[PDB]
């Protein structure tokens, strides 16, 4: 049978990080560095102290 | 002697020496250089005697010492600290595109190439009213004159002997010659000394002088590719007619090369460099020194065009024009901002990066990486101002 | 798309049509309510042991 | 008139040497990374182009 | 299927009229249909077009505005007969916000400081609504108290009965929810109503500027310095306070500045040549950066400050004891008064035009300005 992997379901559920830069936009998948795969960047880069 | 409102620095000094009777070479050397030396040694060491050499844009590094010499004169002649400095031609702080040298005189910057270094002409119909070599003759793009019945500036071979005022410092007559009291478009070309226009329908008919100079420089490299033949009058004379239908011709020049480029296509367009189709027309926009859109009218029309181009080509399954890649230095030009600002704009996530680089590396400013449609939209959305 | 949820405490939730609910915005009536009820069961699951 | 790259890649034809520039530059940063002082400099963005350009020059000179 | 367009109306008003003319009963039904239509050609664009009217405007979207604009263009294109871009009807973020001078929104050539945008209630005018019932853009700007036509006095925030008016919230143009027809039923308020179109007659006051962005700049500066709102909501205070201030100005500005520096001397505990320019003048120079124009003929606040500073130093030449004129300015401050850049000031120091006190003295700047910059 066709399926969707466990962590692929999980990645969708936990996408609720919109606490950065006082601009809600859409939320990020919780990540220690604030990674953003679509733009190839990182919102909470260690250089910021965030 | 008082300066004229339009007088060259060298003209004033020549008159001054002569007014005090310091007519001969030896006393010109003397009344100038030796006096300066005896004030202080630096005012003379920075001061060669030959007239052409005296101006700042001919100078090297020790300009401040030459200025000190100007300041000594300002005291001797009962002046003001900037009375002479308002007249001198200095090194511009502005590159005027592609690292060109450009020269600055109290608010107007003129590219090095337009300085008429040799064979200064004259107009007897004004020299008989006040005899002093005047400014706006030293300009290459300037043949003929306003007023005086127009006609031509009386050119260098007055009488079987080439003339100028610097290798032979007389005003009314020169060397072997006598007191010199000797086709209807150039009187418009003449207006580099001032603007003075009304009912300025062409895009070349309005603005400050620096812009009017830049527009001509651009026209020349782009359409007068023929090697210099010192057709200094005729070569540039045509630029005004050219611009009269500009609002409707520039776009066709750009359209023509979209089609000729397209039929020579070898890769899918979403991996093609913007430059391969438009041939750096964007970089040329940097030859006019102003950054904002309301004054740099060449850039204003190029953006107009690109916005329309994207608008008639929306995204679908097969890639098309509008998906071309720009480099960092190109977005900086279209977005009317410096490069570091684009890096900051990327870092905050306002725009995507399309090519994945290797690790332990960096993407250089020259690398092509943003899609055209993404830049056009972002600019409309968050980069506008009152300019 | 219709979504149905059952839990070990005996609750049932029903979203008749999932195509219209945004990240930001006020949900239509009777749907806003089930969000509150589900929130409560999970708030407990996350915070009290056994 | 063996087998390690820092030995074999130099044994090759001098014309090939310019193409080793990125590898040399890599090793360079690593050597700095392994040094007590170079931990402040290795792989710093500021030094990228400088180091690469001078190496490229040297290689061309060797070629 | 388009309706008559107007040049003076808000984007949201256009959309309401547009949907109604197509037989849609409520906005939510219309926008439902549109959001679904978009999913047939561009899914990212579709995700950028919200269902509720109150958030339709571009200035509301932080990093997704890119997609939102695209979505608007698709609407223009799919609706038949489309010679006109609707992009001319809405607010965008303005570029002048860099450096946090203040936030501002742009519309068709004028920047509006963000604080002048209405949020929770929307006044309207019945003598204009009977003639053509659509919402004018100017009604969203706080300064616009009073209508410039039909007498226009005392425009209400509450039409009838017990309810304030907000047409976006209740989605309605002619009627409020209690059913009142909005269309049925001092002299100087006009001095502000005219912000609509400037259009002033020649006069003595400083606010005789023809550039609209600068007129707003001027109002903002005044509000920020005098009508501080520590104590109150400012519904219209500006109408009785600003007009006078910028009319008694030949003296009023000098009195304030003259008092401020004299007052400063009274409290001048420390040897004056170690005191900052800002310690005495309170950054009034930095505030001169709030007006969007840099040329002297429009920025009259800076122009008058130079007047004052020139005479202030001129009455206080150099002597053995620290005195007025021996206050310190940074290269950034001198650059501001000198209408130049920082590097150019560094060059002026480097070429000997002015010395370093350890950083420049006020007398140095005024003297260098009068001496070399005319």
mmCIF file of C-alpha atoms in Angstrom, chain E:
data_model
loop_
_atom_site.group_PDB
_atom_site.id
_atom_site.type_symbol
_atom_site.label_atom_id
_atom_site.label_comp_id
_atom_site.label_asym_id
_atom_site.label_seq_id
_atom_site.Cartn_x
_atom_site.Cartn_y
_atom_site.Cartn_z
ATOM 1 C CA UNK E 1 -18.201 43.602 -16.300
ATOM 2 C CA UNK E 2 -16.449 46.450 -14.545
ATOM 3 C CA UNK E 3 -18.221 49.421 -12.860
ATOM 4 C CA UNK E 4 -17.199 53.059 -13.246
ATOM 5 C CA UNK E 5 -13.721 53.571 -11.803
ATOM 6 C CA UNK E 6 -12.876 56.746 -9.933
ATOM 7 C CA UNK E 7 -9.494 58.356 -9.327
ATOM 8 C CA UNK E 8 -10.035 59.211 -5.665
ATOM 9 C CA UNK E 9 -11.170 55.976 -4.041
ATOM 10 C CA UNK E 10 -9.716 53.239 -1.853
ATOM 11 C CA UNK E 11 -8.977 49.755 -3.179
ATOM 12 C CA UNK E 12 -11.295 48.143 -0.692
ATOM 13 C CA UNK E 13 -14.201 50.210 -1.912
ATOM 14 C CA UNK E 14 -13.562 49.242 -5.467
ATOM 15 C CA UNK E 15 -13.653 45.574 -4.577
ATOM 16 C CA UNK E 16 -16.976 45.774 -2.781
ATOM 17 C CA UNK E 17 -18.573 47.533 -5.695
ATOM 18 C CA UNK E 18 -17.057 45.071 -8.139
ATOM 19 C CA UNK E 19 -18.459 41.980 -6.452
ATOM 20 C CA UNK E 20 -21.947 43.426 -6.000
ATOM 21 C CA UNK E 21 -22.207 44.236 -9.702
ATOM 22 C CA UNK E 22 -21.687 40.525 -10.383
ATOM 23 C CA UNK E 23 -24.626 39.242 -8.403
ATOM 24 C CA UNK E 24 -22.677 38.170 -5.379
ATOM 25 C CA UNK E 25 -24.541 38.816 -2.170
ATOM 26 C CA UNK E 26 -21.724 39.005 0.385
ATOM 27 C CA UNK E 27 -18.006 39.580 0.194
ATOM 28 C CA UNK E 28 -17.163 36.254 1.799
ATOM 29 C CA UNK E 29 -18.994 34.402 -0.965
ATOM 30 C CA UNK E 30 -17.178 36.426 -3.649
ATOM 31 C CA UNK E 31 -13.726 36.016 -2.166
ATOM 32 C CA UNK E 32 -14.451 32.390 -1.608
ATOM 33 C CA UNK E 33 -14.994 32.070 -5.350
ATOM 34 C CA UNK E 34 -11.876 34.003 -6.265
ATOM 35 C CA UNK E 35 -9.541 32.123 -3.993
ATOM 36 C CA UNK E 36 -10.773 28.919 -5.576
ATOM 37 C CA UNK E 37 -10.510 30.243 -9.096
ATOM 38 C CA UNK E 38 -6.777 30.978 -8.598
ATOM 39 C CA UNK E 39 -6.025 27.341 -7.717
ATOM 40 C CA UNK E 40 -6.583 26.510 -11.374
ATOM 41 C CA UNK E 41 -3.423 28.411 -12.477
ATOM 42 C CA UNK E 42 -1.025 29.329 -9.592
ATOM 43 C CA UNK E 43 -1.064 27.712 -6.196
ATOM 44 C CA UNK E 44 1.446 30.015 -4.499
ATOM 45 C CA UNK E 45 -0.552 33.082 -5.617
ATOM 46 C CA UNK E 46 -3.790 31.486 -4.328
ATOM 47 C CA UNK E 47 -2.227 30.996 -0.962
ATOM 48 C CA UNK E 48 -1.629 34.739 -0.909
ATOM 49 C CA UNK E 49 -5.237 35.902 -1.281
ATOM 50 C CA UNK E 50 -7.116 36.042 2.060
ATOM 51 C CA UNK E 51 -10.876 35.722 2.395
ATOM 52 C CA UNK E 52 -11.708 38.601 4.783
ATOM 53 C CA UNK E 53 -11.939 42.212 3.575
ATOM 54 C CA UNK E 54 -10.144 43.829 6.502
ATOM 55 C CA UNK E 55 -6.808 42.409 5.473
ATOM 56 C CA UNK E 56 -6.987 42.896 1.726
ATOM 57 C CA UNK E 57 -4.532 45.799 1.497
ATOM 58 C CA UNK E 58 -0.920 45.328 0.569
ATOM 59 C CA UNK E 59 0.628 47.283 3.392
ATOM 60 C CA UNK E 60 -0.560 44.540 5.688
ATOM 61 C CA UNK E 61 1.680 41.775 4.385
ATOM 62 C CA UNK E 62 5.231 41.354 5.686
ATOM 63 C CA UNK E 63 7.153 38.927 3.467
ATOM 64 C CA UNK E 64 4.453 37.563 1.302
ATOM 65 C CA UNK E 65 3.561 40.818 -0.408
ATOM 66 C CA UNK E 66 5.455 39.597 -3.409
ATOM 67 C CA UNK E 67 2.904 36.916 -4.056
ATOM 68 C CA UNK E 68 0.051 39.164 -3.098
ATOM 69 C CA UNK E 69 0.829 41.637 -5.852
ATOM 70 C CA UNK E 70 0.927 38.837 -8.400
ATOM 71 C CA UNK E 71 -2.480 37.731 -7.267
ATOM 72 C CA UNK E 72 -3.885 41.199 -7.851
ATOM 73 C CA UNK E 73 -2.542 41.221 -11.387
ATOM 74 C CA UNK E 74 -4.241 37.966 -12.125
ATOM 75 C CA UNK E 75 -7.541 39.465 -11.031
ATOM 76 C CA UNK E 76 -7.072 42.409 -13.331
ATOM 77 C CA UNK E 77 -6.396 40.062 -16.184
ATOM 78 C CA UNK E 78 -9.195 37.574 -15.718
ATOM 79 C CA UNK E 79 -11.911 40.142 -15.278
ATOM 80 C CA UNK E 80 -12.874 41.419 -18.707
ATOM 81 C CA UNK E 81 -12.152 44.890 -20.070
ATOM 82 C CA UNK E 82 -8.988 45.779 -18.222
ATOM 83 C CA UNK E 83 -7.217 48.968 -19.435
ATOM 84 C CA UNK E 84 -6.473 49.991 -15.830
ATOM 85 C CA UNK E 85 -4.222 48.563 -13.168
ATOM 86 C CA UNK E 86 -5.753 48.373 -9.719
ATOM 87 C CA UNK E 87 -2.289 48.728 -8.306
ATOM 88 C CA UNK E 88 -2.831 52.468 -8.367
ATOM 89 C CA UNK E 89 -5.482 52.122 -5.677
ATOM 90 C CA UNK E 90 -3.467 50.824 -2.699
ATOM 91 C CA UNK E 91 -0.830 51.437 -0.030
ATOM 92 C CA UNK E 92 2.708 50.011 -0.282
ATOM 93 C CA UNK E 93 5.614 50.122 2.168
ATOM 94 C CA UNK E 94 7.724 53.185 1.395
ATOM 95 C CA UNK E 95 11.464 53.199 0.912
ATOM 96 C CA UNK E 96 12.113 56.164 3.171
ATOM 97 C CA UNK E 97 11.624 54.008 6.296
ATOM 98 C CA UNK E 98 15.343 52.936 6.294
ATOM 99 C CA UNK E 99 17.190 54.076 9.414
ATOM 100 C CA UNK E 100 13.885 54.097 11.269
ATOM 101 C CA UNK E 101 13.159 57.761 10.684
ATOM 102 C CA UNK E 102 9.532 56.687 10.954
ATOM 103 C CA UNK E 103 7.460 54.086 9.140
ATOM 104 C CA UNK E 104 5.651 55.281 6.061
ATOM 105 C CA UNK E 105 3.331 53.980 3.390
ATOM 106 C CA UNK E 106 3.368 55.116 -0.233
ATOM 107 C CA UNK E 107 0.564 55.985 -2.562
ATOM 108 C CA UNK E 108 0.987 57.292 -6.096
ATOM 109 C CA UNK E 109 3.686 59.817 -5.331
ATOM 110 C CA UNK E 110 3.031 60.858 -1.762
ATOM 111 C CA UNK E 111 4.546 59.206 1.308
ATOM 112 C CA UNK E 112 2.273 59.181 4.310
ATOM 113 C CA UNK E 113 3.777 58.692 7.736
ATOM 114 C CA UNK E 114 2.238 55.561 9.208
ATOM 115 C CA UNK E 115 0.817 57.196 12.316
ATOM 116 C CA UNK E 116 -1.721 59.167 10.326
ATOM 117 C CA UNK E 117 -3.609 56.079 9.149
ATOM 118 C CA UNK E 118 -7.031 55.452 10.676
ATOM 119 C CA UNK E 119 -7.676 52.032 12.074
ATOM 120 C CA UNK E 120 -10.878 51.375 14.050
ATOM 121 C CA UNK E 121 -13.505 53.822 12.806
ATOM 122 C CA UNK E 122 -14.267 55.531 9.559
ATOM 123 C CA UNK E 123 -16.059 58.824 9.183
ATOM 124 C CA UNK E 124 -17.945 59.624 6.022
ATOM 125 C CA UNK E 125 -19.858 62.487 4.350
ATOM 126 C CA UNK E 126 -23.589 62.272 3.330
ATOM 127 C CA UNK E 127 -23.506 65.294 1.020
ATOM 128 C CA UNK E 128 -20.943 63.423 -1.052
ATOM 129 C CA UNK E 129 -22.442 59.921 -0.693
ATOM 130 C CA UNK E 130 -25.808 60.930 -2.190
ATOM 131 C CA UNK E 131 -24.076 62.151 -5.291
ATOM 132 C CA UNK E 132 -21.916 59.049 -5.772
ATOM 133 C CA UNK E 133 -21.789 56.392 -3.129
ATOM 134 C CA UNK E 134 -18.202 55.315 -2.826
ATOM 135 C CA UNK E 135 -15.563 55.768 -0.199
ATOM 136 C CA UNK E 136 -12.924 58.393 -0.720
ATOM 137 C CA UNK E 137 -9.282 57.732 -0.014
ATOM 138 C CA UNK E 138 -8.693 60.902 1.907
ATOM 139 C CA UNK E 139 -11.044 59.717 4.639
ATOM 140 C CA UNK E 140 -8.394 57.361 5.875
ATOM 141 C CA UNK E 141 -6.025 60.197 6.916
ATOM 142 C CA UNK E 142 -6.321 61.625 10.401
ATOM 143 C CA UNK E 143 -5.516 65.201 9.491
ATOM 144 C CA UNK E 144 -8.590 65.271 7.305
ATOM 145 C CA UNK E 145 -11.144 66.573 9.801
ATOM 146 C CA UNK E 146 -14.064 68.298 8.138
ATOM 147 C CA UNK E 147 -15.096 67.908 4.494
ATOM 148 C CA UNK E 148 -13.678 70.399 2.018
ATOM 149 C CA UNK E 149 -17.019 70.563 0.235
ATOM 150 C CA UNK E 150 -20.658 71.170 1.258
ATOM 151 C CA UNK E 151 -19.813 73.229 4.345
ATOM 152 C CA UNK E 152 -18.378 70.060 5.798
ATOM 153 C CA UNK E 153 -18.317 70.801 9.465
ATOM 154 C CA UNK E 154 -18.379 68.305 12.297
ATOM 155 C CA UNK E 155 -18.031 64.980 10.470
ATOM 156 C CA UNK E 156 -19.273 62.164 12.701
ATOM 157 C CA UNK E 157 -17.851 58.879 13.886
ATOM 158 C CA UNK E 158 -21.408 57.637 14.799
ATOM 159 C CA UNK E 159 -24.299 58.119 12.281
ATOM 160 C CA UNK E 160 -27.305 57.308 14.405
ATOM 161 C CA UNK E 161 -28.536 55.210 17.268
ATOM 162 C CA UNK E 162 -25.945 53.387 19.352
ATOM 163 C CA UNK E 163 -23.237 52.426 16.879
ATOM 164 C CA UNK E 164 -20.026 53.928 15.497
ATOM 165 C CA UNK E 165 -19.315 53.568 11.830
ATOM 166 C CA UNK E 166 -16.831 51.202 10.278
ATOM 167 C CA UNK E 167 -17.682 50.190 6.712
ATOM 168 C CA UNK E 168 -14.950 47.629 6.291
ATOM 169 C CA UNK E 169 -16.011 45.745 9.377
ATOM 170 C CA UNK E 170 -19.702 45.565 8.590
ATOM 171 C CA UNK E 171 -19.058 45.337 4.891
ATOM 172 C CA UNK E 172 -21.540 48.003 3.816
ATOM 173 C CA UNK E 173 -21.616 51.335 1.965
ATOM 174 C CA UNK E 174 -25.087 52.874 2.311
ATOM 175 C CA UNK E 175 -26.411 51.392 5.502
ATOM 176 C CA UNK E 176 -25.190 50.517 8.955
ATOM 177 C CA UNK E 177 -26.305 47.342 10.685
ATOM 178 C CA UNK E 178 -29.096 48.942 12.748
ATOM 179 C CA UNK E 179 -30.546 50.002 9.398
ATOM 180 C CA UNK E 180 -29.961 53.758 9.363
ATOM 181 C CA UNK E 181 -29.540 55.081 5.806
ATOM 182 C CA UNK E 182 -26.208 56.830 6.092
ATOM 183 C CA UNK E 183 -27.135 59.180 3.346
ATOM 184 C CA UNK E 184 -29.999 60.926 5.267
ATOM 185 C CA UNK E 185 -28.896 63.917 7.378
ATOM 186 C CA UNK E 186 -15.349 75.813 13.423
ATOM 187 C CA UNK E 187 -15.226 77.652 10.112
ATOM 188 C CA UNK E 188 -11.458 77.290 10.118
ATOM 189 C CA UNK E 189 -11.377 73.459 10.125
ATOM 190 C CA UNK E 190 -10.908 73.980 6.399
ATOM 191 C CA UNK E 191 -7.338 75.000 6.970
ATOM 192 C CA UNK E 192 -6.752 71.273 7.456
ATOM 193 C CA UNK E 193 -9.439 69.897 5.233
ATOM 194 C CA UNK E 194 -7.446 71.293 2.400
ATOM 195 C CA UNK E 195 -4.624 68.883 2.986
ATOM 196 C CA UNK E 196 -6.795 66.958 0.449
ATOM 197 C CA UNK E 197 -5.416 68.940 -2.424
ATOM 198 C CA UNK E 198 -3.094 71.493 -0.829
ATOM 199 C CA UNK E 199 -4.392 74.302 -3.085
ATOM 200 C CA UNK E 200 -3.536 77.166 -0.743
ATOM 201 C CA UNK E 201 -3.623 80.916 -1.453
ATOM 202 C CA UNK E 202 -0.471 82.986 -0.977
ATOM 203 C CA UNK E 203 0.281 83.606 2.670
ATOM 204 C CA UNK E 204 2.626 84.527 5.453
ATOM 205 C CA UNK E 205 2.827 81.174 7.376
ATOM 206 C CA UNK E 206 5.565 78.646 6.868
ATOM 207 C CA UNK E 207 3.127 75.995 5.693
ATOM 208 C CA UNK E 208 2.891 77.246 2.145
ATOM 209 C CA UNK E 209 4.752 74.242 0.698
ATOM 210 C CA UNK E 210 3.538 72.839 -2.606
ATOM 211 C CA UNK E 211 5.069 69.389 -2.089
ATOM 212 C CA UNK E 212 2.488 67.115 -0.439
ATOM 213 C CA UNK E 213 4.951 64.735 1.173
ATOM 214 C CA UNK E 214 6.663 67.628 2.882
ATOM 215 C CA UNK E 215 3.371 69.052 4.121
ATOM 216 C CA UNK E 216 2.786 65.828 6.032
ATOM 217 C CA UNK E 217 6.381 65.801 7.226
ATOM 218 C CA UNK E 218 5.829 69.254 8.763
ATOM 219 C CA UNK E 219 2.663 68.172 10.549
ATOM 220 C CA UNK E 220 4.420 65.127 11.939
ATOM 221 C CA UNK E 221 7.323 67.165 13.265
ATOM 222 C CA UNK E 222 4.941 69.505 15.030
ATOM 223 C CA UNK E 223 2.941 66.662 16.626
ATOM 224 C CA UNK E 224 6.093 64.947 17.770
ATOM 225 C CA UNK E 225 7.497 68.079 19.429
ATOM 226 C CA UNK E 226 4.444 69.895 20.891
ATOM 227 C CA UNK E 227 1.206 67.896 20.742
ATOM 228 C CA UNK E 228 2.895 65.115 22.704
ATOM 229 C CA UNK E 229 -0.311 63.239 23.701
ATOM 230 C CA UNK E 230 1.095 62.263 27.042
ATOM 231 C CA UNK E 231 -2.329 63.395 28.323
ATOM 232 C CA UNK E 232 -4.848 62.973 25.443
ATOM 233 C CA UNK E 233 -6.185 61.581 22.177
ATOM 234 C CA UNK E 234 -5.678 64.216 19.488
ATOM 235 C CA UNK E 235 -8.827 64.233 17.434
ATOM 236 C CA UNK E 236 -8.325 67.654 15.888
ATOM 237 C CA UNK E 237 -6.062 69.600 18.186
ATOM 238 C CA UNK E 238 -3.725 70.417 15.371
ATOM 239 C CA UNK E 239 -6.319 72.725 13.754
ATOM 240 C CA UNK E 240 -6.062 75.291 16.530
ATOM 241 C CA UNK E 241 -2.444 74.744 17.490
ATOM 242 C CA UNK E 242 -0.401 74.207 14.330
ATOM 243 C CA UNK E 243 -1.855 77.060 12.341
ATOM 244 C CA UNK E 244 -0.695 79.624 14.887
ATOM 245 C CA UNK E 245 2.682 78.111 15.549
ATOM 246 C CA UNK E 246 3.632 78.322 11.909
ATOM 247 C CA UNK E 247 2.264 81.809 11.615
ATOM 248 C CA UNK E 248 4.032 83.571 14.533
ATOM 249 C CA UNK E 249 7.186 81.859 13.463
ATOM 250 C CA UNK E 250 9.556 84.720 12.704
ATOM 251 C CA UNK E 251 9.763 85.253 16.386
ATOM 252 C CA UNK E 252 8.326 82.155 17.909
ATOM 253 C CA UNK E 253 11.089 80.013 16.557
ATOM 254 C CA UNK E 254 13.753 82.366 17.726
ATOM 255 C CA UNK E 255 12.259 82.779 21.165
ATOM 256 C CA UNK E 256 12.241 79.052 21.789
ATOM 257 C CA UNK E 257 15.798 78.632 20.567
ATOM 258 C CA UNK E 258 17.073 81.735 22.355
ATOM 259 C CA UNK E 259 15.446 80.695 25.620
ATOM 260 C CA UNK E 260 16.734 77.176 25.317
ATOM 261 C CA UNK E 261 20.384 78.264 25.012
ATOM 262 C CA UNK E 262 20.141 80.978 27.766
ATOM 263 C CA UNK E 263 18.466 78.520 30.006
ATOM 264 C CA UNK E 264 21.366 76.193 29.232
ATOM 265 C CA UNK E 265 23.862 78.806 30.429
ATOM 266 C CA UNK E 266 22.016 79.101 33.751
ATOM 267 C CA UNK E 267 22.494 75.389 34.336
ATOM 268 C CA UNK E 268 25.969 75.252 32.782
ATOM 269 C CA UNK E 269 27.684 73.709 35.783
ATOM 270 C CA UNK E 270 30.567 72.264 33.741
ATOM 271 C CA UNK E 271 33.272 74.226 31.809
ATOM 272 C CA UNK E 272 31.485 74.891 28.548
ATOM 273 C CA UNK E 273 34.090 73.624 26.123
ATOM 274 C CA UNK E 274 33.579 70.016 27.309
ATOM 275 C CA UNK E 275 29.741 70.269 26.812
ATOM 276 C CA UNK E 276 28.132 68.649 23.700
ATOM 277 C CA UNK E 277 26.076 70.469 21.101
ATOM 278 C CA UNK E 278 23.253 68.100 21.956
ATOM 279 C CA UNK E 279 23.536 68.809 25.692
ATOM 280 C CA UNK E 280 22.375 72.279 24.908
ATOM 281 C CA UNK E 281 20.250 71.939 21.803
ATOM 282 C CA UNK E 282 18.395 68.717 22.427
ATOM 283 C CA UNK E 283 18.940 67.143 19.010
ATOM 284 C CA UNK E 284 16.777 69.629 17.164
ATOM 285 C CA UNK E 285 19.299 69.058 14.357
ATOM 286 C CA UNK E 286 18.542 65.371 14.102
ATOM 287 C CA UNK E 287 14.843 66.155 13.893
ATOM 288 C CA UNK E 288 15.552 68.163 10.758
ATOM 289 C CA UNK E 289 15.995 64.816 9.050
ATOM 290 C CA UNK E 290 12.336 63.952 9.457
ATOM 291 C CA UNK E 291 11.196 66.276 6.639
ATOM 292 C CA UNK E 292 11.636 64.330 3.405
ATOM 293 C CA UNK E 293 13.264 67.178 1.425
ATOM 294 C CA UNK E 294 16.972 68.003 1.629
ATOM 295 C CA UNK E 295 17.151 71.286 -0.289
ATOM 296 C CA UNK E 296 16.949 74.540 1.655
ATOM 297 C CA UNK E 297 13.950 75.947 -0.171
ATOM 298 C CA UNK E 298 11.646 73.263 1.180
ATOM 299 C CA UNK E 299 13.205 72.359 4.539
ATOM 300 C CA UNK E 300 12.491 75.582 6.355
ATOM 301 C CA UNK E 301 13.083 74.173 9.868
ATOM 302 C CA UNK E 302 16.774 73.617 9.181
ATOM 303 C CA UNK E 303 16.979 76.867 7.304
ATOM 304 C CA UNK E 304 15.780 78.827 10.345
ATOM 305 C CA UNK E 305 18.043 76.934 12.672
ATOM 306 C CA UNK E 306 20.979 77.989 10.628
ATOM 307 C CA UNK E 307 19.875 81.540 10.877
ATOM 308 C CA UNK E 308 19.757 81.366 14.585
ATOM 309 C CA UNK E 309 23.035 79.481 14.969
ATOM 310 C CA UNK E 310 24.835 81.912 12.754
ATOM 311 C CA UNK E 311 23.877 84.852 14.902
ATOM 312 C CA UNK E 312 24.413 82.936 18.088
ATOM 313 C CA UNK E 313 28.034 82.264 17.252
ATOM 314 C CA UNK E 314 28.518 85.680 15.690
ATOM 315 C CA UNK E 315 27.680 87.348 18.977
ATOM 316 C CA UNK E 316 30.197 85.009 20.682
ATOM 317 C CA UNK E 317 33.690 85.071 19.038
ATOM 318 C CA UNK E 318 36.780 83.268 20.386
ATOM 319 C CA UNK E 319 38.413 84.392 23.666
ATOM 320 C CA UNK E 320 40.452 83.022 26.597
ATOM 321 C CA UNK E 321 37.434 81.460 28.302
ATOM 322 C CA UNK E 322 35.093 78.754 27.040
ATOM 323 C CA UNK E 323 31.942 80.425 25.775
ATOM 324 C CA UNK E 324 29.009 79.868 23.454
ATOM 325 C CA UNK E 325 30.389 78.498 20.291
ATOM 326 C CA UNK E 326 32.783 76.152 21.996
ATOM 327 C CA UNK E 327 30.294 73.285 22.021
ATOM 328 C CA UNK E 328 31.262 70.052 20.381
ATOM 329 C CA UNK E 329 29.732 68.577 17.171
ATOM 330 C CA UNK E 330 30.444 65.231 15.507
ATOM 331 C CA UNK E 331 31.440 64.833 11.882
ATOM 332 C CA UNK E 332 27.835 63.649 11.330
ATOM 333 C CA UNK E 333 26.495 66.803 12.917
ATOM 334 C CA UNK E 334 28.732 69.118 11.063
ATOM 335 C CA UNK E 335 27.894 67.226 7.896
ATOM 336 C CA UNK E 336 24.233 67.865 8.556
ATOM 337 C CA UNK E 337 24.605 71.608 9.128
ATOM 338 C CA UNK E 338 27.047 71.907 6.247
ATOM 339 C CA UNK E 339 24.734 69.996 3.871
ATOM 340 C CA UNK E 340 27.478 67.555 3.028
ATOM 341 C CA UNK E 341 28.706 64.016 3.694
ATOM 342 C CA UNK E 342 30.900 62.604 6.457
ATOM 343 C CA UNK E 343 33.778 61.692 4.256
ATOM 344 C CA UNK E 344 33.682 65.174 2.805
ATOM 345 C CA UNK E 345 33.951 66.531 6.339
ATOM 346 C CA UNK E 346 36.844 64.209 6.960
ATOM 347 C CA UNK E 347 38.439 65.575 3.824
ATOM 348 C CA UNK E 348 37.862 69.129 5.056
ATOM 349 C CA UNK E 349 39.667 68.259 8.290
ATOM 350 C CA UNK E 350 42.359 66.494 6.393
ATOM 351 C CA UNK E 351 42.880 69.374 4.046
ATOM 352 C CA UNK E 352 43.097 71.851 6.822
ATOM 353 C CA UNK E 353 39.863 73.627 6.651
ATOM 354 C CA UNK E 354 39.074 72.880 10.223
ATOM 355 C CA UNK E 355 40.914 71.472 13.277
ATOM 356 C CA UNK E 356 40.045 68.757 15.808
ATOM 357 C CA UNK E 357 39.319 69.615 19.444
ATOM 358 C CA UNK E 358 40.475 66.380 21.002
ATOM 359 C CA UNK E 359 35.101 66.743 17.943
ATOM 360 C CA UNK E 360 34.624 70.064 16.155
ATOM 361 C CA UNK E 361 33.478 73.232 17.850
ATOM 362 C CA UNK E 362 30.280 74.969 16.903
ATOM 363 C CA UNK E 363 32.177 78.117 16.079
ATOM 364 C CA UNK E 364 34.334 76.040 13.721
ATOM 365 C CA UNK E 365 31.244 74.835 11.837
ATOM 366 C CA UNK E 366 29.420 78.118 11.555
ATOM 367 C CA UNK E 367 32.620 79.871 10.481
ATOM 368 C CA UNK E 368 33.518 77.260 7.994
ATOM 369 C CA UNK E 369 29.955 77.311 6.677
ATOM 370 C CA UNK E 370 29.765 81.063 6.226
ATOM 371 C CA UNK E 371 33.276 81.215 4.921
ATOM 372 C CA UNK E 372 33.410 78.486 2.352
ATOM 373 C CA UNK E 373 29.963 77.171 1.496
ATOM 374 C CA UNK E 374 28.009 79.947 -0.173
#
